[PDB]
Amino acid sequence: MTEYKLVVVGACGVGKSALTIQLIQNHFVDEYDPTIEDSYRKQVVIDGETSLLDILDTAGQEEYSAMRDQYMRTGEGFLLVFAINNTKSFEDIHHYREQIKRVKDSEDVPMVLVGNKSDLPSRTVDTKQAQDLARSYGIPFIETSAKTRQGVDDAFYTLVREIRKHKEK
Numbered sequence: 001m002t003e004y005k006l007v008v009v010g011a012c013g014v015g016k017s018a019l020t021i022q023l024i025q026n027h028f029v030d031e032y033d034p035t036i037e038d039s040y041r042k043q044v045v046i047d048g049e050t051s052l053l054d055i056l057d058t059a060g061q062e063e064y065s066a067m068r069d070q071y072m073r074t075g076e077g078f079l080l081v082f083a084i085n086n087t088k089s090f091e092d093i094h095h096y097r098e099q100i101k102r103v104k105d106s107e108d109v110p111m112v113l114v115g116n117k118s119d120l121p122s123r124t125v126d127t128k129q130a131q132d133l134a135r136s137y138g139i140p141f142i143e144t145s146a147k148t149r150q151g152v153d154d155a156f157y158t159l160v161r162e163i164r165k166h167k168e169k
């Protein structure tokens with residue numbers, strides 16, 4: 001049975017954990033320890049294809065040990081998450097993009113740009129600017145709310161499709 005290793009990255013507080021739990025369990029967790037990094041597994045049906053998602057919810061600390069690279073390098077695809085009400089989280093996307101390129105040693109890594117917290121009326125990041133960034137990278141852009149589940153299937157299933165597309169090549 002097919003296993004896809006997904007990795008969720010992005011600034012503290014963007015909603016990595018809430019997005020992951022929303023995908024795996026179908027509810028919103030508004031308080032999950034910000035330091036806690038863990039893998040979540042779920043059997044899914046995408047485009048009629050049965051598979052196992054193994055999703056790393058990144059946290060811990062910013063460090064570049066051999067061991068941290070090895071672990072991130074096992075990811076087949078990455079969700080680059082920012083929050084639509086946090087400009088800095090949006091600017092930080094380039095950092096994560098660059099680290100993924102470095103550890104996979106490739107310009108062609110399956111990635112999806114995720115603008116989370118789409119339910120909030122305190123937007124600081126233009127959807128236009130977001131789309132232009134995803135376009136500059138050659139990757140899909142999905143607006144999400146972990147709170148309302150808006151876009152959550154779309155974000156994870158899109159990334160699986162990007163991985164399948166990479167695995168065919």
Ligand SMILES: *C[C@H](F)C(=O)N1CCN(c2nc(OC[C@@H]3CCCN3C)nc3c2CCN(c2cccc4cccc(Cl)c24)C3)C[C@@H]1CC#N
Pocket residue numbers: 008009010011012013034035058059060061062063064065068069072073092095096099100103
């Ligand atoms: C809030 C909670 F602690 C959290 O989610 N964290 C802490 C930060 N951490 C992290 N942070 C950065 O950068 C943070 C800012 C942005 C620009 C540079 N700094 C100032 N970068 C990373 C990580 C986790 C470890 N990451 C890493 C390390 C080696 C290889 C590699 C390969 C691909 C992708 C990554 Cl993220 C890699 C770099 C983690 C987490 C925030 C997240 N995600």
Ligand SMILES: Nc1nc2c(ncn2[C@@H]2O[C@H](COP(=O)(O)OP(=O)(O)O)[C@@H](O)[C@H]2O)c(=O)[nH]1
Pocket residue numbers: 010011012013014015016017018019029030031032033034116117118119120144145146147148
């Ligand atoms: N309104 C709203 N709040 C969210 C959403 N996703 C996460 N949050 C909140 O944002 C904060 C950080 O979420 P968390 O999942 O811990 O972020 P992480 O550090 O990237 O794991 C918490 O207070 C969450 O309740 C969302 O889609 N909408």
Ligand SMILES: [Mg+2]
Pocket residue numbers: 016017018032033034035036057058059
């Ligand atoms: Mg978290």
